[PDB]
Design an enzyme around this catalytic site. Sequence first.
Site, PDB file in Angstrom:
ATOM      1  N   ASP B  89      10.245  76.308 -38.496  1.00 23.18           N
ATOM      2  CA  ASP B  89       9.350  76.458 -39.669  1.00 23.18           C
ATOM      3  C   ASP B  89       8.050  77.139 -39.238  1.00 23.18           C
ATOM      4  OD1 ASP B  89       8.620  75.991 -42.396  1.00 23.18           O
ATOM      5  OD2 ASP B  89       7.869  73.974 -41.909  1.00 23.18           O
ATOM      6  N   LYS B  91       6.686  80.034 -40.258  1.00 23.09           N
ATOM      7  CA  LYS B  91       5.875  80.666 -41.293  1.00 23.09           C
ATOM      8  C   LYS B  91       5.198  81.935 -40.770  1.00 23.09           C
ATOM      9  CE  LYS B  91       5.171  76.541 -44.111  1.00 23.09           C
ATOM     10  NZ  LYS B  91       4.228  75.877 -45.006  1.00 23.09           N
ATOM     11  N   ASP B  94       2.184  87.760 -40.355  1.00 26.68           N
ATOM     12  CA  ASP B  94       1.372  88.823 -39.734  1.00 26.68           C
ATOM     13  C   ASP B  94       2.036  90.157 -40.050  1.00 26.68           C
ATOM     14  OD1 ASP B  94      -0.523  90.172 -37.934  1.00 26.68           O
ATOM     15  OD2 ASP B  94      -0.663  88.271 -36.799  1.00 26.68           O
ATOM     16  N   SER B 149       4.274  73.308 -51.558  1.00 24.17           N
ATOM     17  CA  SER B 149       4.161  71.929 -52.083  1.00 24.17           C
ATOM     18  C   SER B 149       2.707  71.461 -52.187  1.00 24.17           C
ATOM     19  CB  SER B 149       4.948  70.975 -51.229  1.00 24.17           C
ATOM     20  OG  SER B 149       4.470  70.940 -49.888  1.00 24.17           O
TER      21      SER B 149
HETATM   22  O1  LIG Z   1      -5.682  88.881 -38.295  1.00 24.91           O
HETATM   23  C1  LIG Z   1      -5.614  90.056 -37.822  1.00 24.91           C
HETATM   24  O2  LIG Z   1      -6.305  90.429 -36.858  1.00 24.91           O
HETATM   25  C2  LIG Z   1      -4.788  91.051 -38.571  1.00 24.91           C
HETATM   26  C3  LIG Z   1      -4.785  91.026 -39.960  1.00 24.91           C
HETATM   27  C4  LIG Z   1      -4.372  92.158 -40.672  1.00 24.91           C
HETATM   28  O3  LIG Z   1      -4.519  92.289 -41.919  1.00 24.91           O
HETATM   29  N1  LIG Z   1      -3.847  93.217 -39.993  1.00 24.91           N
HETATM   30  C5  LIG Z   1      -3.744  93.237 -38.659  1.00 24.91           C
HETATM   31  O4  LIG Z   1      -3.279  94.248 -38.076  1.00 24.91           O
HETATM   32  N2  LIG Z   1      -4.120  92.113 -37.895  1.00 24.91           N
HETATM   33  C6  LIG Z   1      -3.868  92.031 -36.433  1.00 24.91           C
HETATM   34  O5  LIG Z   1      -4.721  92.960 -35.750  1.00 24.91           O
HETATM   35  C7  LIG Z   1      -3.978  93.728 -34.785  1.00 24.91           C
HETATM   36  C8  LIG Z   1      -3.791  95.169 -35.235  1.00 24.91           C
HETATM   37  O6  LIG Z   1      -3.389  95.871 -34.067  1.00 24.91           O
HETATM   38  P1  LIG Z   1      -3.242  97.478 -34.076  1.00 24.91           P
HETATM   39  O7  LIG Z   1      -2.506  97.943 -35.327  1.00 24.91           O
HETATM   40  O8  LIG Z   1      -2.475  97.747 -32.797  1.00 24.91           O
HETATM   41  O9  LIG Z   1      -4.652  98.038 -33.962  1.00 24.91           O
HETATM   42  C9  LIG Z   1      -2.647  93.008 -34.629  1.00 24.91           C
HETATM   43  O10 LIG Z   1      -2.695  92.034 -33.566  1.00 24.91           O
HETATM   44  C10 LIG Z   1      -2.441  92.302 -35.955  1.00 24.91           C
HETATM   45  O11 LIG Z   1      -1.695  91.097 -35.738  1.00 24.91           O
HETATM   46  O1  LIG Z   2       8.080  75.359 -44.782  1.00 24.00           O
HETATM   47  C1  LIG Z   2       8.064  74.106 -44.983  1.00 24.00           C
HETATM   48  O2  LIG Z   2       9.004  73.364 -44.649  1.00 24.00           O
HETATM   49  C2  LIG Z   2       6.938  73.555 -45.797  1.00 24.00           C
HETATM   50  C3  LIG Z   2       6.460  74.284 -46.880  1.00 24.00           C
HETATM   51  C4  LIG Z   2       5.719  73.637 -47.876  1.00 24.00           C
HETATM   52  O3  LIG Z   2       5.416  74.173 -48.977  1.00 24.00           O
HETATM   53  N1  LIG Z   2       5.359  72.334 -47.698  1.00 24.00           N
HETATM   54  C5  LIG Z   2       5.719  71.629 -46.620  1.00 24.00           C
HETATM   55  O4  LIG Z   2       5.387  70.422 -46.515  1.00 24.00           O
HETATM   56  N2  LIG Z   2       6.442  72.238 -45.574  1.00 24.00           N
HETATM   57  C6  LIG Z   2       6.718  71.540 -44.291  1.00 24.00           C
HETATM   58  O5  LIG Z   2       7.658  70.481 -44.518  1.00 24.00           O
HETATM   59  C7  LIG Z   2       7.221  69.261 -43.892  1.00 24.00           C
HETATM   60  C8  LIG Z   2       6.750  68.239 -44.916  1.00 24.00           C
HETATM   61  O6  LIG Z   2       6.708  67.005 -44.213  1.00 24.00           O
HETATM   62  P1  LIG Z   2       6.410  65.620 -44.987  1.00 24.00           P
HETATM   63  O7  LIG Z   2       5.247  65.787 -45.959  1.00 24.00           O
HETATM   64  O8  LIG Z   2       6.107  64.664 -43.851  1.00 24.00           O
HETATM   65  O9  LIG Z   2       7.712  65.221 -45.667  1.00 24.00           O
HETATM   66  C9  LIG Z   2       6.101  69.667 -42.945  1.00 24.00           C
HETATM   67  O10 LIG Z   2       6.606  69.963 -41.627  1.00 24.00           O
HETATM   68  C10 LIG Z   2       5.523  70.925 -43.562  1.00 24.00           C
HETATM   69  O11 LIG Z   2       5.018  71.772 -42.521  1.00 24.00           O
END
Ligand SMILES: O=C(O)c1cc(=O)[nH]c(=O)n1[C@@H]1O[C@H](COP(=O)(O)O)[C@@H](O)[C@H]1O
Ligand SMILES: O=C(O)c1cc(=O)[nH]c(=O)n1[C@@H]1O[C@H](COP(=O)(O)O)[C@@H](O)[C@H]1O
Lengths: 256, 256
Positions: B89, B91, B94, B149
């Site tokens: 999980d 998520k 990026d 959720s």
């Molecule tokens: O949170 C970030 O830095 C991020 C957000 C976003 O909108 N776009 C984005 O490119 N980044 C991050 O910033 C870096 C961009 O790298 P370059 O495209 O190589 O310059 C990467 O590590 C991405 O994961």
């Molecule tokens: O992707 C998920 O599973 C997730 C999405 C979401 O909308 N809400 C959510 O609770 N989860 C995940 O599902 C689990 C919920 O756990 P409990 O609240 O303990 O039942 C956690 O590990 C969360 O990270």
Amino acid sequence: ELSFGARAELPRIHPVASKLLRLMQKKETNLCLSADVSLARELLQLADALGPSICMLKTHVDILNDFTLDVMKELITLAKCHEFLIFEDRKFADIGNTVKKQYEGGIFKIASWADLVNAHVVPGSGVVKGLQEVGLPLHRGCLLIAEMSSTGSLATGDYTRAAVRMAEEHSEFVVGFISGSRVSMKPEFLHLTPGVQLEAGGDNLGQQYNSPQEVIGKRGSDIIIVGRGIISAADRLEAAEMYRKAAWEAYLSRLG
Amino acid sequence: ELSFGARAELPRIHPVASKLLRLMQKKETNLCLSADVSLARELLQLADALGPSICMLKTHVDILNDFTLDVMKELITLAKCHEFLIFEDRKFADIGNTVKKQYEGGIFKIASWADLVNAHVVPGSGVVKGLQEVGLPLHRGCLLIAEMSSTGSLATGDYTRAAVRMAEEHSEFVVGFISGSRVSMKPEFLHLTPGVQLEAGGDNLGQQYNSPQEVIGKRGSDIIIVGRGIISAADRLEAAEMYRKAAWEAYLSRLG
Ligand SMILES: O=C(O)c1cc(=O)[nH]c(=O)n1[C@@H]1O[C@H](COP(=O)(O)O)[C@@H](O)[C@H]1O
Ligand SMILES: O=C(O)c1cc(=O)[nH]c(=O)n1[C@@H]1O[C@H](COP(=O)(O)O)[C@@H](O)[C@H]1O
């Protein structure tokens, strides 16, 4: 418009933001290196050589093949020596109860070494509440992702406004934004902008680039985040200096 | 409405979805255990004891204090023995170029052991394109987060519709959704719903609960994801059986 040095003194400034703004003005740098490498030795050699040129080093700890907490000890030594913050670009994006454990615990212990982390706002404000329960006691700061650089980003309109409201309501912990532009009118909040290169273009997986002059000068952001524009260059120190001088002059010219 | 066993045979079914739907019907389980623990020994003892009761075990590899790839080898042995899928999980949220490295590489090597991962849609479809460049060759599947959720979730209206479109346009890799409800009318797509407990309530960090009867029976989802409702109980096997019987009967009664 206040200088970085004056913003560092604003009444409502967060201590992490103040430390950053002070070293930006002292060093004449608003460049964040995106250290997107898989080897600890390359991460540390870049941090040491480019340290004087940067206000911040952004990590993705989860792409490092040879991560250990000792690598991060050596990175902190370089951050203290050269004066830059460490920003782990983890993009926390789960329920509050989950992100508090992802921030404090596991193998990475992110909160133990990262000055800054960031979060997506899509789960609602519980993501910030969960992070702040670890981050406040550890004197850390957080950035909220208000806009993204990638093609098809849904972080627009009401979404961006929700990110700004969430930041402003958690100012004890949230110190600014990942954004493409100035999104908050409150000068206490940092704007960091990725998707930056000197030349027009993109990548094959939805990345889009704008120049330092565009995002600092025209769009009013504070800091450029640069990965491949530096990392893929032969001479990463001269590339970093090109980006630093571009972002710094764009900032000065907006100040007038 | 088709049974899980008939959906496993649909022409456009993904192989990972087919494997899951087959074992759901064979074992009479549509329960996913959310194994939200910090100790490898507790993760493996839960996987072994609850394996027969579950169709899926959901991990957060980044909260495990003693993660090693060998722990995940032992988890795969249990998944094969008891017949359940492993869902990390993570998520992903990026740009495409970053998530491909976060999925394949670093310490966790998620793609090497996770049948399923999930992604947020907010960055645009490059997040899916980046993941699928690792996941397609490794015969993996992905879930898109269409609804959440937690209190204040922005995954509503046009956002949810964008997630469904993105899934349907990447059906080679995307096998379904994290959602609170049936969001796709295409029966090839799995709906997994977290925020589930038998009793009304929530947590202190924005989690909200609905019952298995509500989310499977009334809201038309396929699988319940349950963490603390099982994990915090004294007898986790009897708790898992309570949740399994609730979700399975709700599914049967919707089938009529
Ligand atoms: O949170 C970030 O830095 C991020 C957000 C976003 O909108 N776009 C984005 O490119 N980044 C991050 O910033 C870096 C961009 O790298 P370059 O495209 O190589 O310059 C990467 O590590 C991405 O994961
Ligand atoms: O992707 C998920 O599973 C997730 C999405 C979401 O909308 N809400 C959510 O609770 N989860 C995940 O599902 C689990 C919920 O756990 P409990 O609240 O303990 O039942 C956690 O590990 C969360 O990270």
